[PDB]
Design a protein around this nucleic acid. Structure first.
Lengths: 124, 155, 189, 252
RNA sequence: GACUCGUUCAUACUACAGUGGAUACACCAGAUCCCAUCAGAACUCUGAAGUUAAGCACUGUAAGGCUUGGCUAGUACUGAGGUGGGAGACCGCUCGGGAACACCAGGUGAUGAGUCAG
RNA sequence: AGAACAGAAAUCUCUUGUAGACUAAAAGGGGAAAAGCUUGUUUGAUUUCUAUUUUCAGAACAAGUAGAAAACGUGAAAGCGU
RNA sequence: AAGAUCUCUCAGGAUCGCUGGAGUUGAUUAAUAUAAUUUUACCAGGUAGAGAUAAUGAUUAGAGGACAGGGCCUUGACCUAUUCUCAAACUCCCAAUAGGUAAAAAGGGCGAAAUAACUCAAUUUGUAUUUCACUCAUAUUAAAUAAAAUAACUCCAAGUGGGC
RNA sequence: CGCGGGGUGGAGCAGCCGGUAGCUCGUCGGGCUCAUAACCCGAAGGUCGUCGGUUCAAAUCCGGCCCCCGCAACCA
């Protein structure tokens, strides 16, 4: 059939909490590990993070890979060791939400859910 | 006690329900002439050019038009005298008045009637005459189908 | 002690309940309200009797408490505690104020006009006259003159006794616990 | 509390229908519409450009109380009549579409004889104003290409110059409207990988268009354009509702 | 049949379903150049390989809401009059004007201008 | 609803979200492709003048509104900025 | 007249209001101007009322559900539909009363010609103005009714500013 | 009953001038001494009257209640 299961985003995120040498080192390490330039937190910068996409995200998952209630209802998931990250899945046609000319909502019976994600996890 | 500009307008300059936010462009496009009568009726979104409390829902002649302003001569009672006061209002607050539109429609029908009456060579009376005269009248209801009523008793 | 209540026979001045503006209110005497078999359903009793306003009585918090407690004791002594429900239908909310410029807070009243039930008792058909008598005793602790009524409603629901039986017979009335829904032919099952 | 409630539904006020669709800004639109009130009987022309994912649409619209009256209209798939069969979304197509709409407008007026506009790139013509087009503004956007084409066509649309290259560069603009950048990318793509080139530009090959040919074809087309402009009912629902309620109980 | 600009601004909303894809829309493919970011996600640019799975359109639902109409109710309320009544509080009468919630029944849009394939 | 340290609160993500936030400060109005928040460019918080509106004598002062004559600032332009 | 504004002002003064005189204008053509009046059009409202199942603040009960307390069970909170009584400084809806514009001749219709340094692409493309036209009821008056000019307007001044 | 000042360790003062609460005595553990103190060394201890509010941050600033002291009641 037409339908699909696909990664949307993987996010590396570290709220270090010492706000200096370790954080600056960590963000450079995260950049070294996956090429994309980091983006950063605030203060009550305390945290470093970056988005990872497609093939590259799958590579990070693959090294990561080697509780069953880790999944969200929307089929997204993450873990740590130590160092940690989180994965969001969305199939094609998600664009309709963002698409500026005609922004709108996806059908409920077309959203990813738990079951498809769980099957994908078993698949890989 | 205090008497600032918007003094006593909490209820009056409130929005009507389901009418919140900016209103349609096509309100603004509405065409105005010098010597039109025009009502001053104010949406509360646009705050510049907002007229004083007394002029809300009032009507008067347009005497001057500007870029997005309209001058309206409005009558105000000042103690023992009514005088005409130059209220500047916005395109937002002007509503085309309707008393004139009844006169215009009345004139149009009368003009056609005048043309017909002149064509037929018979006089007519334009007058918006009395209400009260009733001709003689008939009730054809069957004599046992008429409704029989009596007073209402207590609880 | 406090002001002699005779003055508050008249209803006058704007309503003055508690507010963000006011602060510093004295508490009600009556925080007790209703008595009897509290969680009892409408199907579990059959009648209702009512003590009804007839003076334009303000009704002090203490008067409401005093009447109710007296009523309750008379009901428990006569007809037993679990064999009725005594309902305090009116709720005081209006705060008086006094001086020895604006008055300092004084006790709570309800400012009640004529034709409103103040107190009501729900019970079996056997004890409605007893309940009416308890209300008659209660009236002697209410300001001015009141009136008394016994309804042909099934009670604690707006339906007639005959209406209750008919709707119940054809299953059109379902109890949600005292409160009852009349089935209006809508929604899922 | 749960998010969705009767009070919330009752209170909620809808946004305007076209804004729901996504089409109209309103805030820009009213300024685009509204003439100075003392300057009555003159209605601001919108030069409408909307960029569809298949071809671009260029209109002359004039606002009236019962809605916009459309004076002139051009779509890229009219360019087919002028020998352009592919590249409909393109910058070059947008320029041509703009030129074509202006030419059609001028022909309608008969003003074409007075103002031909400038033949080929580096009393007064009618003034008109570019539509919102709902796009985040950029150098080299297709709305600007269409505005340039319309101006070169003949219209007096007033504009700034830094949404074209060189923030001015005429050569880069000239390359853009010719399609030279497409041609160079085709040649580069062929150099890199020929399967990848064929798989990309499938239509251009079917049409029989090489990279070289695009600029010439656009010049020929410009000259050609210049030369020649169910519902159910209540009784039925009652019967059906009764039957389905009975049936589901009888089945289960 | 399809689309663009609109208009009224819920009959147009919301919620869950079902039905539809000649042309079209869209989803979708790519990043050299213009461009844009943490990210071609968006935006920008360039494509046209696939697809109704979605968007979108249409319809359905004891839907919710909104919306008209009845009924609530000539009830509540109220202007004027009265050497009218009532201990007062208040309540009639004469001349007049006159609601709202709930409930019940219906409805769930219409439309200006232009375009493409009929 | 999920994710190392990380817990009731720390950051990050997806879903839902008519404003229940915020709008220097009072309280009340208005405000969702903003009037809120982030960012870019800036100093019109400019010079000159009316008709006026508010208070009201319909004097003053003070606060406004709608324009005009300049010079510019900003935006792709319409525009907007006293 | 005992209202008003400013006042070292509160037993006062000034200036407004109301009053008188004097004049002029209008008037004599049963009218038009005009009006503590309605009519028919046309608006503007959020006080009385009404509401808590619309928001805010309250506020009494049970019922149905998946984090906490007590000793596998129970009590709560919490979600969900209800339920009792509510507000000068709360508002879904919402009066009466009071208020404004309207009912044609120094004007209005539809036409022509003129004028601009305003106006649009565009010397009729509009705008506005002006000159010429053609013509709108009033020979009971483009809804009534009116000891409707006893109306206007100017001048000069008084008394008054503690009222009940 | 009308005005104005004040509530922080067991006790009494600092901080109380917004983020990090100090000092002494008292209390507590160890020394010294026939024995006990005095004396020496080292620690523990603040819930900032209470209910609500501002502010990035409140024990402090902002209110209302609760206590505590200071004024006040005069011409009649």
């Amino acid at each position: 059939v037409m339908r699909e299961i696909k990664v949307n985003k993987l996010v590396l995120n570290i709220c270090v909490g010492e706000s200096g040498d370790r954080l600056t080192r960590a963000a450079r390490v995260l950049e070294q590990l996956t090429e994309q330039k980091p983006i950063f937190g605030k203060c009550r910068k305390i945290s470093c993070f970056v988005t990872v996409r497609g093939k590259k995200a799958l590579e990070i998952l693959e090294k990561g890979l080697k509780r069953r209630k880790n999944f969200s209802d929307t089929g997204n998931f993450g873990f740590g060791i130590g160092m940690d990250f989180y994965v969001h899945l969305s199939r094609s046609g998600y664009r309709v939400t963002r698409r500026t000319r005609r922004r709108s909502k996806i059908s409920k019976t077309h959203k990813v859910t738990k079951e498809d994600a769980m099957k994908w996890f078993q698949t890989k | 006690k205090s008497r600032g500009k918007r003094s006593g307008t909490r209820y009056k300059f409130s929005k009507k329900f389901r009418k919140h936010g900016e209103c349609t462009a096509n309100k603004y496009l509405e065409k105005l002439n010098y010597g039109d009568y025009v009502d001053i009726v104010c949406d509360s979104t646009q705050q510049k050019g907002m007229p004083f409390n007394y002029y809300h829902g009032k009507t008067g002649k347009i005497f001057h038009i500007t870029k997005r302003g309209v001058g309206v001569l409005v009558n105000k009672r000042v103690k023992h005298r009514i005088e005409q006061k130059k209220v500047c209002v916005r395109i937002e607050h002007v509503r085309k008045s309707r008393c004139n539109e009844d006169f215009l429609l009345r004139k149009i029908k009368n003009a056609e009637l005048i043309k017909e009456a002149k064509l037929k060579n018979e006089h007519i009376n334009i007058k918006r005459k009395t209400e009260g005269p009733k001709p003689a009248a008939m009730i054809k209801v069957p004599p046992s189908k008429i409704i029989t009523i009596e007073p209402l008793p207590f609880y | 002690g406090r002001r002699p209540a005779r003055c508050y026979r008249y209803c006058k001045n704007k309503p003055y309940p508690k507010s963000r503006y006011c602060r510093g209110v004295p508490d009600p005497k009556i925080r007790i309200y209703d008595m009897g078999r509290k969680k009892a359903d409408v199907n579990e009793f059959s009648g209702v009797v009512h003590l009804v306003s007839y003076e334009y009585e303000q009704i002090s918090s203490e008067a409401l408490e005093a009447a109710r407690i007296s009523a309750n004791k008379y009901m428990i002594t006569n007809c037993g505690k679990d064999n009725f429900h005594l309902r305090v239908r009116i709720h005081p909310f209006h705060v008086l104020r006094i001086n020895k410029a604006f008055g300092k807070p004084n006790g709570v009243v309800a400012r009640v006009d004529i034709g409103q039930v103040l107190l009501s008792i729900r019970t079996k058909e056997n004890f409605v006259s007893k309940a009416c008598e308890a209300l008659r005793r209660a009236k002697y602790k209410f300001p001015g003159r009141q009136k008394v009524f016994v309804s042909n409603k099934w009670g604690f629901t707006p339906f007639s006794k005959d209406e209750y039986q008919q709707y119940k017979k054809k299953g059109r009335i379902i109890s949600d616990g005292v409160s009852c829904k009349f089935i209006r032919e809508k929604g899922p099952l | 509390k749960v998010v969705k409630n009767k009070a919330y539904f009752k209170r909620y006020q809808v946004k305007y229908r076209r804004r729901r669709e996504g089409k109209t800004d309103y805030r820009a639109r009213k300024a685009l519409i509204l003439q100075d009130k003392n300057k009555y009987n003159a209605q601001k022309l919108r030069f409408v450009v909307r960029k569809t994912n298949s071809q671009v649409i260029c209109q002359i619209a004039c606002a009236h109380i019962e809605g916009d009256k459309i004076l002139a209209e051009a779509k890229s798939k009219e360019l087919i009549r002028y020998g352009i069969p592919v590249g409909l979304k393109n910058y070059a197509a947008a320029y041509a579409t703009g030129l074509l709409c202006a030419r059609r407008f001028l022909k309608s007026l008969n003003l074409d004889t007075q103002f031909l506009g400038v033949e080929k790139v580096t009393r007064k013509p009618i003034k008109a104003f570019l539509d919102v087009g709902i796009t985040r503004t950029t150098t080299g956007n297709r709305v600007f290409a269409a505005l340039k084409g319309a101006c070169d066509g003949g219209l007096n649309i007033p504009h700034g110059n830094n949404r074209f290259p060189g923030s001015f560069n005429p050569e880069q603009l000239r390359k853009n409207i010719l399609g030279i950048h497409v041609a160079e990318y085709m040649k580069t793509l062929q150099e890199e990988d020929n399967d990848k080139y064929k798989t990309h530009f499938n239509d251009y090959l079917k049409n029989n268009i090489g990279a070289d040919d695009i600029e010439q074809m656009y010049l020929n087309a410009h000259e050609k354009i210049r030369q020649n402009p169910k519902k159910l009912n209540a009784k039925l629902r009652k019967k059906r509702v009764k039957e389905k309620l009975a049936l589901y109980v009888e089945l289960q």
